[PDB]
């Protein structure tokens, strides 16, 4: 009965723990010891973007490192231009409570979603010249927390139902559903080759998926609170994860372990966003103490502080060419650092 | 270089045409209030898909009223998106024990880190069953709460004519039970407003109107150091 199944699960857990312990002999710190330090770094807010009424939950960059899109709870989806500080489009929304935003890689479509349980696709290339709804996707039973484009016809969505979904915009139906989590899944990120993706949830675990087969391959547990944001290492063989216990972690796919933890005593808030730079040497982290930190990914030392915001930091992003960093907060502003 | 000038001119025109309507929407947005309904005859109160939305006006003042629908029961993460709402209308029935669960929910929503500015309008529903049932001798209040045996009715109670002393004792005990948590924590930023309500009635919208008036007046008096 249930007791026998629990005993079998315990036996497999012990076997996996032993298999992980066998493969580990030396820590990453014992290797990255004699390498030169990165030194102090400084960044100045050489931009400021104004015009929202309420706070900001989500922003997303573009392919050309020029245009970004931002979502606000006054019911507005704004497309900006980082160079000349101009607004190109300002989409109204039928639902005021939005929580996520996404920009398609072809530059033709934008996505939106929130507490209405529906993912909406907005078209930007219209003969009439008006930006209207092109498709509404409604098959979820909980709020949408993150969505990302694959092509102009496929989308991946994440909800508070403990599920993830793969859609098909042309037809309007779900193709595959991923169900392994026990608590709300908060964020997800796509691998460079569009074959796999990792997700983090409110049960203090990260999971690895496959897009075609639809099965889960790896589960990682090293935290003590809820997972909030996640992102791949640019190589595609590691990823960094952030939680609400004032620590960040680095995980590897080849060894099924955690290599390094980032935490300092004067840090007692949570962590709301994470991102990697181009070369994998720096790790950015946004905090609830109204501050942004830059860590060295190979020594775990506080490489710099960015302090210019007056409220909680929610969204953070880095361009594809590694030029600038963009930060949003609950004061209805976006800043472009460098 | 003419093409660059044309592009810059087009972009500036688009920006201006957008900003005008942004300002109009600002003006329309600022003059509307927002309320979160949470909890219990919700249909009774409202009469008198994740979100159900209701719009109404009293004395040419406009309100938005938001009720959560198709959602789970984990409130940890979607309760933050109501940081700036002017009032949480909390409906609780006064009659497992539901009341102690309501107490724990109130304590959690009161002490949260992002909700230390929001105020709570409390509704204590089911007055008829609160009065009729207790006269039969069913000790619903003496056993669940063992502090009730030595509670004395306060000096300011003003019951409606014909009320039994036991009924008013029970009502004021419940109200004081809710009002113990509110005073201990909030240091002048946010308050709690109690209101007895009936299943058949027509005066709840006026109560919400007056309470919103009071909260906004209190905030303005607070910024100038008068209060």
């Amino acid at each position, epitope marked *: 009965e249930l007791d026998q199944l629990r005993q079998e699960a315990e036996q497999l857990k012990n076997q996996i723990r032993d298999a992980r312990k066998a493969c580990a002999d030396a820590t990453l710190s014992q290797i990255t010891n004699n390498i030169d330090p990165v030194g102090r770094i400084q960044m100045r807010t050489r931009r400021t973007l104004r015009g929202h009424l309420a706070k900001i939950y989500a922003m997303h960059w573009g392919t050309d490192s020029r245009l970004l899109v931002s979502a606000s709870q006054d019911g507005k989806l704004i497309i900006w231009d980082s160079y000349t500080t101009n607004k190109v489009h300002a989409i109204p929304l039928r639902s005021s409570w939005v929580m996520t935003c996404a920009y398609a890689p072809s530059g033709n479509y934008v996505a939106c979603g929130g507490l209405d349980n529906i993912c909406s696709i907005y078209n930007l290339k219209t003969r009439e010249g008006n930006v209207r709804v092109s498709r509404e996707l409604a098959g979820h039973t909980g709020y949408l927390s993150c969505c990302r484009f694959l092509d102009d016809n496929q989308i991946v969505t994440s909800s508070g139902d403990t599920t993830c979904a793969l859609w098909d915009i042309e037809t309007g139906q779900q193709t595959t559903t991923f169900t392994g989590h*026990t*608590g709300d899944v908060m964020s997800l990120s796509l691998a460079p080759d569009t074959r796999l993706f990792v997700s983090g949830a*409110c*049960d*203090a675990s990260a999971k690895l998926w496959d897009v075609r087969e639809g099965m889960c391959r790896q589960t990682f*547990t090293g935290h*003590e*609170s*809820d997972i909030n944001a996640i992102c791949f290492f640019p190589n595609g063989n590691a990823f960094a994860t952030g939680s*609400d*216990d*004032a620590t960040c972690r680095l995980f590897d796919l080849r060894a099924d372990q955690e290599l390094m933890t980032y935490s300092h005593d004067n840090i*007692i808030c*949570g962590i709301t966003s994470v991102s990697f730079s181009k070369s994998g040497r720096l790790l950015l982290a946004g905090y609830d103490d109204f501050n942004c930190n830059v860590w060295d990914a190979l020594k775990a030392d506080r490489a710099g502080v960015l302090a210019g915001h007056d409220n909680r930091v929610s969204c953070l992003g880095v361009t594809d060419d590694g030029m600038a960093v963009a930060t949003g907060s609950w004061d209805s502003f976006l800043k472009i650092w460098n | 270089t003419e093409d660059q000038r044309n592009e810059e001119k087009a972009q500036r025109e688009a920006n201006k045409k957008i900003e005008k309507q942004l300002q109009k929407d600002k003006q329309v947005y600022r003059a509307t209030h927002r309320l979160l309904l949470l909890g219990s005859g919700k249909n009774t109160i409202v009469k008198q898909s994740g979100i159900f939305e209701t719009k109404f006006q009293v004395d040419k003042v406009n309100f938005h009223m938001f009720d959560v629908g198709a959602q789970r*029961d*984990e*409130r*940890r993460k979607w*309760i933050q998106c109501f940081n700036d709402v002017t009032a949480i209308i909390f409906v609780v029935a006064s009659s*497992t*024990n539901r009341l*102690q*669960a309501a107490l*724990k929910l109130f*304590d*959690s929503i*009161w*002490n*949260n*880190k992002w909700l230390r500015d929001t105020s709570v309008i409390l509704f204590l529903n089911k007055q008829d069953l609160l009065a009729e049932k207790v006269l039969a001798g069913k000790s619903k209040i003496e*056993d*669940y*709460f*063992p*502090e009730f045996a030595r509670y004395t009715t306060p000096e300011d109670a003003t019951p409606e004519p014909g009320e039994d002393p036991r009924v008013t004792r029970a009502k004021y005990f419940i109200r004081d039970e809710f009002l113990r948590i509110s005073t201990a924590s909030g240091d002048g930023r946010h308050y709690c407003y109690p209101h007895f309500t009936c299943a058949v009635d027509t005066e709840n919208i006026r109560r919400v109107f007056n309470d919103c008036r009071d909260i906004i007046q209190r905030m303005h008096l607070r910024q100038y150091e008068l209060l």
Partner: nanobody, 127 residues
Framework: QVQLQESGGGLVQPGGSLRLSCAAS????????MNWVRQAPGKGLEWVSD????????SYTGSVKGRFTISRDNAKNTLYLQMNSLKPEDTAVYYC?????????????????????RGQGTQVTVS
């Protein structure tokens, strides 16, 4: 990994006494606030009692006030519940729950189905 094990329990004669233990591993026991919950046959989940970080703020539900006691040990990472003078109404499964975040003053969902940081529980019976 966040693992919580419960020890003690079983059948106890009415008007008796019992002791229950909760051992936790996978997190810093001294940064979190802890509580107990129960779940009866045919009924939902219900709150019992709790303890703060240091051990100063102790609360109770009211239907067990003065009869049960709760205690906390940090050097051994173990939380205790002592039960006295039982009754036929006190038969249910008992769970040892932890609030979702450190250094906090409140926690929302410890009495909701499908919550992460909750143990398997123990069975106590009074007859």
């Amino acid at each position: 990994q966040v693992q919580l094990q419960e020890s003690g329990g079983g059948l106890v004669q009415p008007g008796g006494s019992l002791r229950l233990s909760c051992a936790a591993s996978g997190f810093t026991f001294s940064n979190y606030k802890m509580n107990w919950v129960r779940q009866a046959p045919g009924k939902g989940l219900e709150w019992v009692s709790d303890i703060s970080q240091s051990g100063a703020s102790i609360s109770y539900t009211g239907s067990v006030k003065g009869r049960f006691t709760i205690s906390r040990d940090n050097a051994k990472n173990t939380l205790y519940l002592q039960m006295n003078s039982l009754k036929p109404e006190d038969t249910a499964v008992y769970y040892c729950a932890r609030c979702p975040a450190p250094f906090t003053r409140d926690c929302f969902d410890v009495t909701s189905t499908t919550y992460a940081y909750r143990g398997q529980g123990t069975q106590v019976t009074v007859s």
